[PDB]
Amino acid sequence: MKILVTGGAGFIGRWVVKRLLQDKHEVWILDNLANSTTANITEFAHDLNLKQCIQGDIKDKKLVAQLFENNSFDLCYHLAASINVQDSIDDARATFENDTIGTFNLLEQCLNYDVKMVFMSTCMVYDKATNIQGISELDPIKPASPYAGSKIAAENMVLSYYYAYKLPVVVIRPFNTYGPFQKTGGEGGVVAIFINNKLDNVPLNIYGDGKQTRDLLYVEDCADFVVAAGYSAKANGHIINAGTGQDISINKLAELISGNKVSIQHVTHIHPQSEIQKLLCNYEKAKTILNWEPKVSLEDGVIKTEEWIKSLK
Amino acid sequence: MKILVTGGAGFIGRWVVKRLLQDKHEVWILDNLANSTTANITEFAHDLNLKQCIQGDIKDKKLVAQLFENNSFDLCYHLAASINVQDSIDDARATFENDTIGTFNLLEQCLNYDVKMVFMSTCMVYDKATNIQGISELDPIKPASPYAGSKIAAENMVLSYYYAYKLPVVVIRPFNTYGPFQKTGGEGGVVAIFINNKLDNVPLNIYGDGKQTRDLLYVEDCADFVVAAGYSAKANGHIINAGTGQDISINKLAELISGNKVSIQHVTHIHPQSEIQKLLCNYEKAKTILNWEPKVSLEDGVIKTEEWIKSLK
Ligand SMILES: NC(=O)c1ccc[n+]([C@@H]2O[C@H](COP(=O)([O-])OP(=O)(O)OC[C@H]3O[C@@H](n4cnc5c(N)ncnc54)[C@H](O)[C@@H]3O)[C@@H](O)[C@H]2O)c1
Ligand SMILES: NC(=O)c1ccc[n+]([C@@H]2O[C@H](COP(=O)([O-])OP(=O)(O)OC[C@H]3O[C@@H](n4cnc5c(N)ncnc54)[C@H](O)[C@@H]3O)[C@@H](O)[C@H]2O)c1
Ligand SMILES: O=c1ccn([C@@H]2O[C@H](COP(=O)(O)OP(=O)(O)O)[C@@H](O)[C@H]2O)c(=O)[nH]1
Ligand SMILES: O=c1ccn([C@@H]2O[C@H](COP(=O)(O)OP(=O)(O)O)[C@@H](O)[C@H]2O)c(=O)[nH]1
Ligand SMILES: [Cl-]
Ligand SMILES: [Cl-]
Numbered sequence: 001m002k003i004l005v006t007g008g009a010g011f012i013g014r015w016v017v018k019r020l021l022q023d024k025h026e027v028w029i030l031d032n033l034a035n036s037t038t039a040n041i042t043e044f045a046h047d048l049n050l051k052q053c054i055q056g057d058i059k060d061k062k063l064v065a066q067l068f069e070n071n072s073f074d075l076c077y078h079l080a081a082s083i084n085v086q087d088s089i090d091d092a093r094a095t096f097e098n099d100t101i102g103t104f105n106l107l108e109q110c111l112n113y114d115v116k117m118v119f120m121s122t123c124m125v126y127d128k129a130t131n132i133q134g135i136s137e138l139d140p141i142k143p144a145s146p147y148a149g150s151k152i153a154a155e156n157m158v159l160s161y162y163y164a165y166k167l168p169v170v171v172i173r174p175f176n177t178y179g180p181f182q183k184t185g186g187e188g189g190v191v192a193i194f195i196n197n198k199l200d201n202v203p204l205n206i207y208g209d210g211k212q213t214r215d216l217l218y219v220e221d222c223a224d225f226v227v228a229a230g231y232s233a234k235a236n237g238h239i240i241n242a243g244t245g246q247d248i249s250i251n252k253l254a255e256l257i258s259g260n261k262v263s264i265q266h267v268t269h270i271h272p273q274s275e276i277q278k279l280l281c282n283y284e285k286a287k288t289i290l291n292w293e294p295k296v297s298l299e300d301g302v303i304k305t306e307e308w309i310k311s312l313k
Numbered sequence: 314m315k316i317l318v319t320g321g322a323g324f325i326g327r328w329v330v331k332r333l334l335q336d337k338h339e340v341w342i343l344d345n346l347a348n349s350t351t352a353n354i355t356e357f358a359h360d361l362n363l364k365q366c367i368q369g370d371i372k373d374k375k376l377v378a379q380l381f382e383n384n385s386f387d388l389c390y391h392l393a394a395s396i397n398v399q400d401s402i403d404d405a406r407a408t409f410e411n412d413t414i415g416t417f418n419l420l421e422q423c424l425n426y427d428v429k430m431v432f433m434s435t436c437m438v439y440d441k442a443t444n445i446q447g448i449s450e451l452d453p454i455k456p457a458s459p460y461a462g463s464k465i466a467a468e469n470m471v472l473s474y475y476y477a478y479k480l481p482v483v484v485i486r487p488f489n490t491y492g493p494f495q496k497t498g499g500e501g502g503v504v505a506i507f508i509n510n511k512l513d514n515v516p517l518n519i520y521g522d523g524k525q526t527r528d529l530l531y532v533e534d535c536a537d538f539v540v541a542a543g544y545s546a547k548a549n550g551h552i553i554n555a556g557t558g559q560d561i562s563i564n565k566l567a568e569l570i571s572g573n574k575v576s577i578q579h580v581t582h583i584h585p586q587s588e589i590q591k592l593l594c595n596y597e598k599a600k601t602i603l604n605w606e607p608k609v610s611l612e613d614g615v616i617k618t619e620e621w622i623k624s625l626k
């Protein structure tokens with residue numbers, strides 16, 4: 001198939017690309033490299049099925065039109081986005097423009113050329129879990145940051161095209177994802193930051209009281225879920241979560257990762273008003289529709305991730 | 314108070330303006346007159362509390378910035394929008410730009426100047442009612458047209474500002490509204506169209522099988538609800554419906570309005586894929602928070618509306 005992966009040079013994107021190339025699809029990447037480098041895709045530089053890596057912006061309407069007009073895509077995995085909650089609080093407009101308007105630009109061309117869209121949403125668009133069964137696709141939404149609001153906004157434009165036009169789309173809500181190729185600095189995820197701090201012999205710092213929880217999904221499991229949603233016509237028109245169905249507090253995550261190599265401290269929460277106290281995924285729908293389940297435990301994923309991070313030092 | 318009413322020269326808007334002027338607030342209207350004329354506000358042309366009627370576009374970022382920079386608004390009732398489902402299917406972009414992007418432009422200035430926003434959403438953002446209790450604010454959303462998707466998108470940006478910044482906002486979801494000052498042509502609502510057809514001695518035409526239902530809210534009741542949401546700090550942060558809690562099929566509405574003066578026919582539905590089969594409102598939350606309930610029955614509202622339409626012929 002001919003496939004466009006927006007954000008394909010990013011963390012999750014590069015793993016989506018890897019899987020699609022293993023499956024011998026012709027892949028085009030569209031990525032402005034705002035949050036990544038081509039080091040994430042060097043591995044694929046000699047794969048003839050990686051057709052092009054376009055350094056361009058989903059906000060550039062003319063570029064997006066030309067890209068679809070001059071290719072014949074079957075399928076688009078739309079991962080390109082601004083992803084940082086705090087940045088979206090500091091600067092809502094940029095997050096809105098990238099995550100809602102950029103989506104809309106792509107969606108318009110998907111309709112013009114009958115291109116199925118897998119829209120990468122986020123488990124952040126949820127209000128907190130309230131029990132051990134976790135959050136299903138039927139459970140309440142709560143846009144606690146402009147990032148979350150922009151993602152919900154995008155979801156609803158995407159789904160409107162499915163209803164109004166019968167355009168194949170899937171809205172996916174993976175939970176917090178970690179692993180090799182995730183950044184380790186201030187724009188990184190908590191697992192990457194903590195492992196890197198450990199390797200650097202500096203403390204782990206926990207925002208707030210650390211009791212907040214996350215359901216942490218290893219990136220290779222996430223990428224397989226993302227790809228599966230694109231391949232499945234049964235998924236068309238659906239919202240589908242992915243996660244592990246187990247959560248951990250940030251306090252306990254810090255102890256797991258440090259293993260007492262470094263100290264663990266608390267600091268003022270940067271956005272307690274936008275925090276989600278408990279994130280725990282019910283992924284029964286993904287199991288049913290996609291035959292998907294995660295294979296990598298947190299313990300094993302941390303080990304894999306630390307091996308990767310250490311390899312770059 | 315100093316109040317901005319976007320869309321204040323429109324159908325519901327002019328009634329909001331009337332109420333705010335009765336309550337002796339200083340009102341500014343921002344309206345591009347894309348779907349209205351100043352005849353809707355002639356009544357107020359000598360009220361010194363109607364400060365300005367700006368013919369300008371909420372999509373014009375510079376105009377919106379200047380408007381807030383050079384006034385000191387307390388409160389904004391944001392009614393300006395593209396409202397037509399079929400137009401949003403024919404041309405999603407224009408509806409998106411007006412209803413989502415335009416909202417965002419206003420919201421950004423509301424944050425800058427601490428202006429409470431009442432966001433006018435729509436009961437269309439709902440999946441169908443499934444019982445006689447009707448649709449509450451907790452019930453499922455389904456963006457069946459790009460209009461509905463654009464409205465849900467806007468809701469989520471608005472609510473994100475309440476969470477991230479503690480900006481006072483209210484998201485209101487009134488159900489289908491009818492009455493004096495609603496247009497009677499192809500861009501009008503079903504009640505206006507049917508009454509006008511009756512007065513013109515031409516048939517009523519019903520889309521599809523006519524079994525679809527609506528909860529029809531008289532405009533003076535709607536406008537009082539809208540205003541109340543703005544006046545109430547208890548409503549801050551909430552989604553709140555308004556409606557009557559009774560529905561009628563389009564077949565039965567046509568018989569009520571015609572009274573057999575004219576024939577009643579069925580024609581192919583213009584967008585059956587985007588229709589909502591049953592719309593019935595649970596307005597208990599509005600009753601509790603706002604002490605609001607509707608006063609005008611459908612029968613009496615039809616009579617009032619027909620008197621008004623006849624007066625213009
Ligand atoms: N990391 C997670 O925990 C997680 C969980 C759920 C969903 N998501 C979603 O998955 C997607 C990928 O996230 P990630 O963690 O890989 O982040 P990432 O930043 O590595 O990936 C996003 C990629 O999009 C590119 N990009 C950003 N804005 C763009 C624009 N305007 N035009 C073109 N390219 C642009 C970036 O340069 C980057 O390579 C995002 O949509 C994100 O919201 C991430
Ligand atoms: N009529 C209903 O049944 C109903 C029910 C629920 C919600 N609503 C919502 O109520 C609001 C008012 O609806 P209405 O029925 O009075 O329609 P309307 O068209 O009479 O009112 C909207 C007004 O906004 C103006 N406008 C449109 N786009 C604009 C732009 N870009 N900049 C500036 N002004 C602009 C129009 O000229 C018009 O006067 C809308 O937000 C609509 O979505 C309507
Ligand atoms: O150095 C860090 C980074 C993150 N967190 C916490 O870890 C969780 C996950 O944060 P991340 O930024 O990875 O993603 P988010 O869930 O906010 O998307 C949140 O509760 C953060 O407050 C932390 O305590 N210390
Ligand atoms: O001339 C008309 C206009 C409308 N309708 C129907 O009346 C209902 C209300 O339509 P309207 O356009 O007023 O508003 P909507 O609910 O679609 O916002 C819908 O089921 C329409 O199909 C109709 O049968 N004939
Ligand atoms: Cl995320
Ligand atoms: Cl804990």
Ligand SMILES: [Cl-]
Pocket residue numbers: 396435436437
């Ligand atoms: Cl409406």
Ligand SMILES: [Cl-]
Pocket residue numbers: 523524562564565
């Ligand atoms: Cl009937």
Ligand code: NA
Pocket residue numbers: 246247248249
């Ligand atoms: Na747990």
Ligand code: NA
Pocket residue numbers: 559560561562
């Ligand atoms: Na009824």
